[PDB]
Design a protein around this ligand. Structure first.
Ligand code: ADP
Ligand code: ADP
Ligand code: ADP
Ligand code: ALF
Lengths: 142, 38, 449, 441, 459
């Protein structure tokens, strides 16, 4: 009770009372942690900066997309793996890059709409695009 | 929205500052400083 | 990247038959010693043995430490290699035999499967509930917390024990945070705010993070590498609970303690449960005691019992001293500086001086390791030291000579740049002559005795 | 103040050829030793090579510390230069080995970069809500540029800072959003008159322009030792400064060595290896030397420079002598620099620099006499007489130090050799090594 | 409460109470006897230059050795140096024996005293309002906030001191301080203008009669102005900055508060802390808001220092911020306290001795001893016949100066208990017989302890 301080009902009673009352302890006597982010536990959370740098391809791609974005270079990314184009949009949503996705699991009307969406509006930057399902027939000349 | 029963509010601007006291604290000991004790 | 004394050593350079190639993996010569160190690597990789002792015996600069670091590479990263000097044993916090035991158990590794059983979600409600205690004088106490956790594919309401609420409270959790809870430890981590209401206009510099995908309750499994000493320290200085002792034990100054045999024995029982449960692999490693002549007769007499333990690493000693007085036993002289009844326990790998052509080879290996491109007449110059002077003095000249050559605008070191290096940077013997000639008499300009 | 080496401002070598000038940057002579120290200084700057032990050797004086202080000045502030007296190692709080480990790791910098973000604007309005009987606080800051206004929510830590800083409307403030520190830069409004006790009418400023938020790349250098201390602990990071840190466990250092390498591979950190200078290195024990010799062999070892005055001299903690008082298997790993006692013209040039650093106007004959004293009493004594003769000259209001002032100083203050004769001439009245003494006339 | 003693004040006399200064002309020449000194004209003139060295702020890290036999006035000269500097300059005396702490390494103990000898003088302005609270009154706001019903635009407080009273208009945020601090009418408080907060000293003792029992002590009304704006000059040593940073005093958490309830164990203050302290100090010196005032570390019996202390002092004296060090030694040619193979003059290593300005202190002539007896007698208040003076001086030639200075008080007792207002030969001849010197006692030992025996001395 000394470390963690007065209980919420005690704070209510003390603040609404007719005359002042001294609480116990009267404050939380637990110190401030010296590490302002790690606090009092040894649990670590993986950073998205660590996510970029722990892939050599993605570290090099991240630099490239930065230069390409300032160039205005709307860009198509081809993947041989579906799990990677998931991870890629987790990265693309950690960054601010506006993207859209097409792969062999997207339904046929969703494919028309995404292709026509990307080909309509220049707002979209990265087309995440599967090698086989996205590689044939469509026009991506923008 | 009606203000919180126990957050006393200070605000400061070009006009100087004021303290505003919840109606729930008037008639408590915390009102005594404001002329509004029990 | 930085270049150090042993950067050229990559391994023992043995054949699959266990014979040494005369120049391989950075070594030149020591073939019989490299072959003996190979059989020691085999003794280590075959987990069957505990508490065998090896002594690398030989004069200074004969590559004894290169051999030990080569063993550390042939064992690879999985096996624990635990290097110490004999001068590290004299702690001010705990008896020197404690430090030996800590190093013995640091040299035994464990790989163990661990299931982390956790709750993760956006905190959507948090509602404490409390009791008016009888008059203990500390007042009311929170009896429980009710907390609502939302994940992407579920939600829970959790009625926490108040010791987990103290984790929640000391983690400064609020409604709308994303948190992680371990049912293992009762420990809590505030991961961030939700990405909901992630308005930029906070001074609080929050990390907004996405809602956890999947269910609120998760049961992930991960593989942990630990030593036996890591378990000893965790259980001697408890810190993983939410109890008051674990709490205060994070606020006190950390200090080493003379962990009892009683604790170590009972951790053997605990680890053997992990083995019988099939969740752990025991991976015994090696303790390298460099400068083992700096141990004293109490250290050596303790090592008797420590090596007889039914689990102990392999111990590799190195010593560079002839018949010498045993430290702490000024009455007793013995070879290697090792007590004669302890020396009986060891297998001795004698290590021999290098030939002049081996020195030439080492100089060339070392030059190209440092990136010192070096003419053949310059190699012959440096290799006339090492014969006339220590081998180490050769290798130490390569860097000054490189600087002087580059300052002279050369792409590569000539004999001239070594002949300048020889003059700016003396060996011990030329400096010892300067002392004896200048300190030939006392005075204002004399060296102090 | 003016200290013993305050005139030393570099090594005095041509940066292109490493040729020592006969006098520059306050160093004089020692040309062979200064060139050697310049080659060491270059391989310090290059960083490529780890664990070189260089021993500077010579009689007392002859500039061994002055050379090492010239090296430190030439590295500048960025590269670590840990000065250590060998008598610092005999701690009661930690072993000599641990004390040496910390001294090595103090000499390797980790240079870490981050993008901070800062706010700067006029405070237009503040609101703070406080829970009666303490606990929670809440608030909003309304903050302005010529080009923006925005309302930022505030937490308890920021409200503590705001009230400690006594932030008010019309203040220009900056907030480092990453650290949370606030600084008042000034005020755009006048100080009001409605209240008393408002305090200082701080500097006027025009309102900041542009956006409120600006990113700011900043770089911090921390030792491997400073990373050790805060990672061996949950709490009590003042041990960086108070020295309360115990014998840190090697598991923590092994982890830190691994992670700092990874931070280098990530490009998060640059490792900047510097110098450990162990002065009076002959004061270490055999146990310390048999630690340094293998501590040197690690990839994170600094370059270790040493100085010794000792001849063939006893090694501490053992029964026998060695050159420099250093073990031979230690000296095996050392390249040795020898300094040489100065000539009279070298003495004259040094004393002129000491005189100029102390701003003392010697007459030419006083400098000649101080040189003659320098040859026979020593450079330190002849240096001590400069500041002393200046004071004596001031008693007689002399505008320059004359020969009379140097002679007056020479009379009042004994040199070491004259003091040794004075001791020998009074062996009856001084306390002997036998403890006997005669107090009578 | 306390019953003040009206009786006259007087000063105890110690071995150096007669010394008042170095006794020098404005030309710096020693007067043959002055300020309590007799003779040592060379050593007093040298110390006078050392005094002017210390008062000139060019000095850093110079060393002085006072060299001479026991009794030769080296301690007297150090105290005279201290008196010539006066209280505004630190003088930090220690013996070499005091460096052997059990609680930190001796190089820390020496560096503490090294930094104690360095002073810092900081000038700041104190600016407060101060008094007994005569009133508290809310000023209701012109434009109240909706939903609150109460809105105060100013709180007015009356403060009275002994010298006046003022109506004080305060920003309403002071309600937080008043409510936490429980300020009431009749309490004594101050308002500090760098925060606008208030602190309560206590209840004014004008109200001490409000009740037959109340559980607080009362405090007097502040006897100053109701508003203070004063420059304040703070004496600080750099060692104070060491400790204040390395063990913060005011921390309100359990570990801080448990820490302040346990012995304040010394700690091995890092060079990193000291070097950063120096940099911030040098910043504020360059701002001109502080003066550095280096003083004197005086180490008596410096031959009790060992070779590890001396080798650290090499580094320490080379610091750009450092006191002067004055050493005193009497050890002939003697073995260095921590280097059994090495003997040197003064017991100082030859490496270190070359750094010091040595000042020799010589013996005393028979006529100087007599003049010292005259100075010492009138200081202890004893008065002697000239034949008593000459008898005391004769023992001073034959035995020791100190022994004769120590006969004065015993003989003064024997005189007054014999009804004599001045001491005469009969009393000296009696004091010298009750109180032996070391030599006559050593003769008793040498005669009696020639063997073991039932009545023998033990050896
Ligand atoms: N057979 C060898 N082949 C290549 N390099 C060697 C060999 N033996 C020694 N060295 C190198 O010579 C230097 C000195 O050897 P070291 O192992 O320090 O000897 P010791 O440890 O016995 O004093 C080291 O840089 C080491 O890598
Ligand atoms: N070559 C030099 N140039 C300028 N000053 C010097 C030189 N050599 C010595 N000194 C000065 O003389 C004093 C003693 O030199 P120092 O380097 O301390 O000798 P040591 O090598 O014994 O430490 C110092 O004040 C130093 O500044
Ligand atoms: N020149 C002097 N004039 C007057 N009193 C002196 C003089 N020299 C010594 N004394 C006094 O005689 C005593 C012996 O001197 P002291 O300084 O104690 O000797 P030491 O230098 O051996 O400590 C002290 O009480 C001191 O005050
Ligand atoms: F040949 Al295509 F789209 F490239 F039909």
């Amino acid at each position: 009770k000394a470390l963690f301080g007065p209980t919420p009902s005690e704070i209510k009673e003390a603040s609404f009372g007719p005359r002042p009352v001294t609480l116990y302890p009267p404050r939380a006597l637990l110190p401030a942690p010296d590490h302002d982010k790690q606090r009092f536990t040894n649990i670590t959370v993986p950073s998205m900066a660590r996510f970029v740098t722990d892939s050599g391809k993605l570290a090099k791609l991240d630099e490239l997309l930065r230069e390409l974005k300032e160039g205005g270079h709307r860009v198509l990314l081809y993947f041989q793996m579906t799990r990677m184009i998931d991870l890629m949009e987790e990265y693309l949503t950690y960054r601010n890059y506006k993207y859209c996705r097409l792969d062999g699991s997207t339904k046929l009307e969703d494919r028309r709409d995404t292709v026509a969406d990307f080909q309509t509006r220049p707002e979209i930057f990265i087309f995440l695009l599967s090698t086989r399902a996205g590689g044939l027939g469509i026009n991506l000349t923008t | 929205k009606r203000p919180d029963p126990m957050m006393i509010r200070w605000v400061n601007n070009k006009m100087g500052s004021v303290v505003a006291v919840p109606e729930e604290l008037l008639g408590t000991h915390a009102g005594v400083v404001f002329g509004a004790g029990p | 990247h930085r270049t150090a004394a042993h950067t050229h050593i990559k391994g023992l350079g043995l054949n699959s038959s266990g014979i040494a190639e005369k120049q391989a993996a950075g070594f030149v010569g020591q073939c019989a010693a490299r072959e003996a160190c190979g059989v020691v690597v085999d003794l280590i990789k075959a987990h069957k043995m505990a508490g065998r002792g090896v002594l690398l015996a030989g004069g200074p600069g004969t590559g004894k430490t290169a051999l030990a670091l080569a063993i550390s590479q042939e064992l690879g990263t999985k096996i624990p290699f635990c290097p110490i000097t004999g001068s590290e044993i004299y702690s001010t916090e705990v008896k020197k035999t404690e430090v030996l035991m800590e190093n013995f158990r640091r040299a035994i590794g464990l790989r163990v499967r661990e299931t982390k059983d956790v709750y993760e979600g956006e905190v959507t409600e948090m509602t404490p509930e409390e009791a008016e205690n009888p008059l203990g004088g500390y007042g009311k106490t929170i009896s429980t917390l009710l907390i609502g956790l939302k994940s992407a594919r579920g939600q829970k309401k959790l009625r926490l024990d108040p010791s987990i609420y103290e984790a929640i409270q000391k983690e400064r959790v609020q409604v709308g945070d994303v948190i992680y809870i371990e049912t293992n430890t009762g420990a809590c981590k505030r991961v961030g705010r939700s990405d909901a209401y992630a308005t930029e206009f906070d001074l609080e510099a929050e990390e907004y993070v996405p809602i956890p995908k999947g269910e609120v309750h998760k049961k992930k499994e991960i593989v942990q590498d630990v030593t036996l000493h890591d378990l000893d320290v965790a259980n001697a200085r408890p810190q993983g609970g939410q109890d008051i002792i674990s709490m205060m034990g994070q606020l006190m100054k950390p200090k080493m303690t003379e962990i009892t045999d009683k604790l170590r024995m009972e951790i053997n029982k605990v680890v053997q449960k992990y083995i019988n449960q099939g969740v752990a692999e025991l991976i015994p490693g090696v303790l390298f005691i460099d400068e083992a002549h700096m141990l004293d007769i109490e250290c050596f007499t303790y090592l008797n019992k420590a090596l007889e333990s039914p689990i102990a690493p392999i111990v590799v000693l190195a010593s560079n001293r002839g018949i010498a007085t045993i430290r702490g036993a000024d009455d007793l002289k013995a070879a290697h500086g090792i007590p004669p009844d302890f020396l009986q326990r060891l297998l001795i790998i004698p290590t021999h001086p290098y030939e002049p052509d081996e020195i030439r080879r080492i100089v060339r290996i070392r030059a190209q390791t440092e990136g010192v491109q070096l003419t053949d007449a310059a190699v012959d110059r440096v290799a006339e030291h090492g014969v006339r002077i220590s081998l180490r003095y050769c290798l130490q000249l390569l860097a000054p000579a490189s600087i002087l050559a580059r300052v002279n605008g050369r792409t590569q070191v000539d004999v001239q740049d070594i002949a300048e290096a020889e003059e700016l940077f003396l060996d011990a013997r030329r400096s010892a002559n300067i002392l004896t000639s200048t300190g030939e008499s006392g005075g204002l300009h004399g060296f102090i005795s | 103040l003016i200290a013993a080496h305050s005139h030393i401002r570099g090594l005095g070598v041509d940066a292109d050829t490493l040729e020592p000038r006969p006098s520059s940057q306050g160093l004089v002579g020692q040309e062979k030793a200064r060139k050697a120290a310049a080659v060491v200084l270059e391989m310090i700057k290059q960083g490529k090579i780890a664990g070189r032990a260089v021993l500077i050797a010579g009689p007392p004086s002859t500039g061994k510390t002055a050379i090492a202080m010239g090296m430190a000045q030439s590295l500048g502030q960025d590269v670590p230069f840990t000065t250590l007296a060998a008598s610092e190692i005999f701690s009661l709080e930690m072993s000599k080995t641990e004390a040496l480990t910390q001294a090595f790791r103090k000499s390797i910098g980790v240079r870490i970069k981050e993008e901070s973000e800062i706010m700067e604007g006029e405070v237009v309005e503040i609101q703070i809500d406080r829970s009666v009987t303490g606990g929670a606080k809440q608030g909003k800051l309304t903050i302005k540029t010529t080009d923006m206004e925005a309302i930022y929510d505030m937490g308890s830590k920021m409200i503590d800072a705001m009230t400690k800083e006594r932030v008010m409307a019309g203040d220009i403030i900056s907030i480092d959003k990453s650290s949370g520190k606030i600084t008042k830069l000034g005020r755009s409004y006048a100080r009001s008159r409605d209240y008393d006790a408002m305090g200082v009418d701080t500097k006027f400023l025009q309102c900041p322009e542009g956006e409120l938020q600006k990113r700011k790349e900043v770089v911090h250098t921390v030792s491997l030792h400073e990373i050790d201390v805060i990672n061996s602990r949950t709490q009590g990071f003042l041990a960086l400064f108070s020295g309360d840190t115990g014998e840190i466990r090697s598991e923590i250092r092994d982890q830190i060595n691994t992670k700092v390498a990874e931070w280098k591979e990530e490009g998060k950190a640059e490792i900047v290896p510097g110098v450990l200078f162990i002065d009076e290195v002959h004061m270490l024990d055999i146990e310390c030397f048999s630690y340094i010799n293998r501590a040197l062999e690690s990839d994170l070892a600094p370059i270790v420079i040493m100085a010794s005055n000792r001849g063939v001299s006893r090694i501490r903690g053992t029964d026998y002598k060695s050159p420099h008082g250093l073990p031979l298997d230690f000296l095996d790993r050392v390249v040795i620099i020898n300094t040489h006692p100065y000539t009279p013209d070298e003495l004259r040039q040094i004393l002129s620099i000491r005189a100029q650093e102390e701003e003392v106007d010697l007459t030419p004959d006083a400098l000649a006499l101080l040189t003659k004293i320098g040859q026979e009493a020593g450079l330190r004594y002849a240096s001590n007489l400069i500041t002393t003769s200046q004071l004596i000259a001031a008693k007689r209001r002399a505008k320059q130090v004359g020969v009379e002032d140097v002679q007056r100083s020479f009379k009042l203050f004994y040199d070491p050799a004259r003091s040794v004769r004075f001791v020998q001439e009074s062996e009856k009245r001084l306390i002997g090594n036998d403890g006997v003494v005669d107090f009578s006339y």
